C-alpha cells in the first residue's frame, strides 16, 4: 500500500518533470530563435550603415571638392 | 543621392510567458507530489 | 524503514528539483525581458536612423541643388 | 572628412540547440524511469 | 523486490534529471553570453553612430557656412 | 541642420549568473538525495 503510494507520487512527479522539461527546451528554443534573428538583424544594419556612411562619405567629398573649386 | 533604406530591418520580441508560467505551475504543484507516509 | 528513507529522499529529490524550476523559470524571464529591451532599441534606433538619414539626404539635396545653381 | 568604422561590430549568433535536444531526450527517456510494480 | 525497484528507478530519474539540469545552466550560460554580447555590441554602434553624426553634422555645418558666404 | 539625438538608446544587460550558480548547485546536489538501501 505505502509502495503503490511511492510508486504513484513518483510517476506523478515525473511526468510533471517532463512537462516542465519540454516547456523549458520550447523556451530555450524560442530565445535562440530570438537572439539569431535579433544578431542577424544587428548585422544587416552594420552593413547597411557602412554603405550609408561610405556613400555619405563619396557625397561630402565631391561636394568639398566642388567647393574647394569654386572659392 | 540615394541612401539605402534600413527601415525594413526589425527586430523579433520573445514572447515565452506560457513556458514561464508552467514551469512556476509545475513548480508548484510538485508539492501534491510529496509522499506522506 | 527503507521506505521512510525512499519517501525522505524523494521529497527532498522534489524540494531540489522546485528549487531549480523556480531559477529557471526567473532566468527565463530576465532573459525574456533583456531580449525584448534591446529589440526595442534596435527597433527604435533603426526609425531614429531612418528619420536621420532622410534629414541628411534632404540637406545633401538642398546642397547639390544649391552648387548646381552656383556652378 | 574620414567617418569612424563601424564595420567591426558584430553580433554573435547563440547555439544551444545541443542542450535543447538533451533537454526533449530527457524528457522522453524519463518514461523509462516510471515505476511499473 | 519492489524497494530495489523504486530505488533504482528513482536513482536512473534523478541521474537523467541532473544531466536535464546541466544541460538547461549551459544553455542559459550561452544565452547570456550572447545577449550580453548583442548588447555591448548594440551599445557600441549607437555611440560610434552618435560620433559619426556629430561629424557629419560639423562637416555639413561647414558646408552651408561656406555655401552661405559663396551665394 | 539639427541630426537626432540617439545617444540615449541603450541595451540592458542580462546577469542570470546567481541562477546558472542555483542551477548547477541543485544538480550537484541531487548527489544527496540518491536512495542507498
Not at chain 1, 1 to 10: M, P, R, V
Not at chain 1, 27 to 52: C, F, H, P, R
Amino acid at each position: 500500500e505505502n509502495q503503490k503510494l511511492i510508486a504513484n507520487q513518483f510517476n506523478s512527479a515525473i511526468g510533471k518533470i517532463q512537462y516542465s522539461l519540454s516547456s523549458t527546451a520550447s523556451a530555450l528554443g524560442k530565445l535562440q530563435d530570438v537572439v539569431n534573428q535579433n544578431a542577424q538583424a544587428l548585422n544587416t544594419l552594420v552593413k547597411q550603415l557602412s554603405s550609408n556612411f561610405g556613400a555619405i562619405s563619396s557625397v561630402l567629398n565631391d561636394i568639398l571638392s566642388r567647393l574647394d573649386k569654386v572659392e | 543621392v540615394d541612401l539605402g533604406d534600413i527601415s525594413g530591418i526589425n527586430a523579433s520580441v520573445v514572447n515565452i510567458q506560457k513556458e514561464i508560467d508552467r514551469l512556476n505551475e509545475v513548480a508548484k504543484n510538485l508539492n501534491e507530489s510529496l509522499i506522506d507516509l
